[PDB]
Amino acid sequence: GRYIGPVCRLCRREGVKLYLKGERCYSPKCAMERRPYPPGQHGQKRARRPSDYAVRLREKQKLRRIYGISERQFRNLFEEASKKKGVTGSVFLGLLESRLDNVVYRLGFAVSRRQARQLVRHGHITVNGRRVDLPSYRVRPGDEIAVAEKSRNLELIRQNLEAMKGRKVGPWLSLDVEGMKGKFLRLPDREDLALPVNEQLVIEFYSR
Amino acid sequence: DFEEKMILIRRTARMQAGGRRFRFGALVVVGDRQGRVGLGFGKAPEVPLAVQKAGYYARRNMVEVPLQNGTIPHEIEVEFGASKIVLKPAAPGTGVIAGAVPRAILELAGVTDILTKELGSRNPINIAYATMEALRQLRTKADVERLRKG
Amino acid sequence: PKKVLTGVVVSDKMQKTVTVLVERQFPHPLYGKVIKRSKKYLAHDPEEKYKLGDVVEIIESRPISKRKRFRVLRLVESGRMDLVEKYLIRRQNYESLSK
Amino acid sequence: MLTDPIADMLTRIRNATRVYKESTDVPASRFKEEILRILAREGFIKGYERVDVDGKPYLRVYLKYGPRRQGPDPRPEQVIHHIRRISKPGRRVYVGVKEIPRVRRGLGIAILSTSKGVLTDREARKLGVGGELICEVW
Amino acid sequence: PTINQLVRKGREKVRKKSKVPALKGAPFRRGVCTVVRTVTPKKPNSALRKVAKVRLTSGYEVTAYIPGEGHNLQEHSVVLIRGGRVKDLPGVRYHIVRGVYDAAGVKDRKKSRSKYGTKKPKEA
RNA sequence: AGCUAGUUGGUGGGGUAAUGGCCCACCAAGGCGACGACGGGUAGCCGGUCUGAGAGGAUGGCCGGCCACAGGGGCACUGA
RNA sequence: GGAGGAAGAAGCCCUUCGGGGUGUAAACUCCUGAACCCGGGACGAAACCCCCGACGAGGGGACUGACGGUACCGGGGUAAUAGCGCCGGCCAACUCCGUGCCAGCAGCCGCGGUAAUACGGAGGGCGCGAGCGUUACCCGGAUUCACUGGGCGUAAAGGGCGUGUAGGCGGCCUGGGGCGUCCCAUGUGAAAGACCACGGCUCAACCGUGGGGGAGCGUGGGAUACGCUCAGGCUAGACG
RNA sequence: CCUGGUCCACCCGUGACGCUGAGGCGCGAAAGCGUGGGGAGCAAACCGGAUUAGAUACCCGGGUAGUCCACGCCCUAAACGAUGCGCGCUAGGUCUCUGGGUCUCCUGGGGGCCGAAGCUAACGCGUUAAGCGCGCCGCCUGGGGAGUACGGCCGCAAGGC
RNA sequence: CCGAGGGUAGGGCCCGUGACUGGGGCGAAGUCGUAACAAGGUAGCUGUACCGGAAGGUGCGGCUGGA
RNA sequence: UAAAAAUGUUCUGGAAA
User: Fold this and answer.
1) Residue among C60, C47, C44 at smallest CA distance from C9
2) Tell me, what CATH number does E62's domain have?
3) How far is A91 from chain B, CA to nearest CA, in Å?
4) Any extra detail in the entry (chain B)?
5) I want to staple A126 with a disulfide (CB 3.0 to 4.6 A). Which of A131, B46, D78, E14 is the partner?
6) CATH numeric code, A97-184
């Protein structure tokens, strides 16, 4: 179930800095900022020209690890992302952004991704009226994500909701900071998502 | 300048009184991901040396590819030796559906969407060359017409 | 609609009955090639007026006997012992494919 | 005794085009001329013309090539690159109008024999008819 | 061959032959070792492989291999045949499944224990 | 690799809701087979299911349609 | 479980004895609240039937819930399971020790004979996760029975050679027929499934509604290039 | 003496009568078999001599089937161009057999070599195709087991299919 | 009359089994030789026939995949 | 195209690179 374990252990390995912890992973010590190398006993020696396979693996893991989505879903959602008319490149990336908890994280609310999930698994999060608790819930157009009321007074929801004053949300989401709402104006775009991932490879890895 | 990407390096041997003496083979493909690729096979007593050499010939055995939206004008089945290769145009998003050797070329040529299939002997060198003839032989509605004018 | 077939008359030593050899051609289900093939029908001849080498039409009919489920619709051409010989010859060869 | 007049014709063209011959002779047949008319209109040959070799009706096809080239082997490019008989007597091939093949993504052509005349893939498709698929040429 | 020759003779399906007649394909098959010895392997290699010769519920008496180091099989131990051949043993075409019936798991095994009976040790 | 005596056809019967050698006398000698008859083996068929770029290949469990059977076997009674 | 949390505790493992790794992982700090508790608690069930109207139409009335005191909702609410395979190449993942053609591994090639990324253990890593491997069987890859889409001088593959039966195949011009073939129309092609659109269970899996395919085969109509058939004409194949 | 194929020339006659060919039928080197005949030379088997560790072999001296004829069987082969039959098409150079020519040389049929284009894994093939095409037939699907067994047909047998 | 089944008798197909026996495949370090690969020391291969512990030898004819 | 010339045997199992 959703990994759970040494994550700023993958900020490493994938060698492409990751902030799955948020605050710290954002500090002068993303773990990455002290060891730009993979873990293990070796981790700092010549590296064989990674095979054509390896690259794709790493590209995929880069992405999948970047959400916490466990393979099964990851790869599953991928297939849906295939039949759907269009470029799998956009689509998929888009269908990865439609992930409730994700958006949660995408719209402040939670410092990081792994945290945004729990907010969902406890009710704290709410949609177009009625609340929801499935991290897999897929957001659709014109739907706002609101915090619950019992929470609004919680020490956490505060500080986290504060970091919004000043900072602007992604070009496909709004935000009633005082009224914790913000809608999902439209599926995000390749460019809007500045992710250290080369989707086109992650795609090739599922061909074989 | 271009991308450069080797398809395969290999070590061969010839015999002598004192046993076997070796030599290396670098099959390098180079391009700009926007119309120009070239293949070159270099041979030398040291790998390094061979791959640099295969790079040199590489730029000399070039070929204009008529890219069209990331794909190839039509489909061609070129045979070389006992190595056959088939290129069939694809729609945007498809990507490159080929093996390591032909992909390396098609990708450095700037091809983005393409259906491929190796038939017959899959020898790397031979397929690799059969791929260049293949790309070399493509035409566009444009040059087909300047052929049957009147 | 009652199936109507056209064939030649091979044999008629039966009383009021005539065996007809209906040919047909069609595309091979896998290899394309058009191929002939044939079947023999035991059409009824109450009038006893059709004989050997007679290209006649044959129509589906209420069972007249075991096997006989067709009547002779109408003569289409007379004299074709040629078509009959082929048949006859083919049946003849068989007598050499034995052991 | 020649078992496939057309097949032969396609072949005689292929054979000389490949040795940069100026023109090639082929025994005359009304049906064959049709093919040729199409081969000329779509531009593959320079043209044909009923003529007479040693007192017998022949068809003289005039080949067309590309311009001379550089490097080794300056032999010009070929206008008739491919030309393969599809339907042969050993196995005929009929195609429904929906079934009509698309030759070389459009840069090529198939030649059908329909109840409306020997027309090309485009002509056959537009006319909504289908037929025996004589050959394909690209 | 000519199309006509295909129409006449036609092609021929392959038909695969099983490397394991454990009847009904049966993922497995039960039996009893009537002989439990050690054969000497094929060539390059030398050793003393432990193999049992088992009488089956398929009505066959085959010889199978006892994987892992150290086993507990005797002339009458019921056993579960798995099917998986051994490259050096000319005769053995099946593997005895460790951890089923009289077949004991591999005492003290700690890696790939799932492939050798051997339960799971309590970190105690 | 040849098979066939109710065997193939006829006429008049019995029979049936009804065609028919389905069954019966009598008559005629027929019928079928390398386009694979007869025989031996295996098997319930299909919609579909899995796989495949496709053509194909494999399959027919759940659900739906048809068939067949009811310990093995023969028969009829009631009755639409 | 989440967010914090050390130029980085211990233990275990490596080491060119400086140190490196497991690792923000833990501990530790706050924070949420799977379970469980208390209260509330369904839809699926509206007609048969009854009354007004004629036991018709239409309107109104009453009984009925196995699943269940379940789903679901409100309030309260505890940090609360992790395993399996693999790490020589194919193939993602490497070191130390043990052993010494032994014990064992092995899908293919092959690993072990005293320095073994291949055996066995450990550390470390990779993969996947309430799962993870193994065996059996089907398709793929296998254009490796090749219709699409292969071959036969030397790799498997030309019959010892003739004559010829069935069969297959067939030159040039014209006309009639229209079986092949092609075109329009039309009947048929159940349902479910599949695909697409949209909906209903918090999502999904399931599920509903709608939409679109469909060759085949029947019927009627039409075309005539090519194949076929009848007919007439030819001489370039063939024979004399 | 009887008889087959076949090629050139004249273009005179027929008017597609054509190609191919599962089966069938015929032929089919040598050895081998059955009658009888024949038998010089040769020569399996067999007997010596020599060689050799041995020598059922190589070498030497002998020698019977057989080899030869007739009639009838046998039906195999590296029966080979290891390359099925037919037709069209695609540079030339050279030597050669046989025919016709307005006998510089041309033109037809055949036998060789080298080589256009093209083909091939390569070697090579290349108007005598292994090139480019159409028609029909035979045959191949990893090595061994094995051209073995069982069955059937054939044969006197040996064995063949 | 027909008729399930039972009974006597004799055929056909297939499966299991049998003293003994034929060859076959496989199996780290057995015995004899030396046929083949370099005129492999007698050019090799080949159909057949006779012969020999064994490879094989010789006869007849054929092949070049030998000079 | 024609094609002469040698009496005389043998080397355990793995692994080399």
Assistant:
1) C44
2) 2.40.50.140
3) 11
4) Is positioned such that it could physically interact with spectinomycin.
5) A131
6) 3.10.290.10
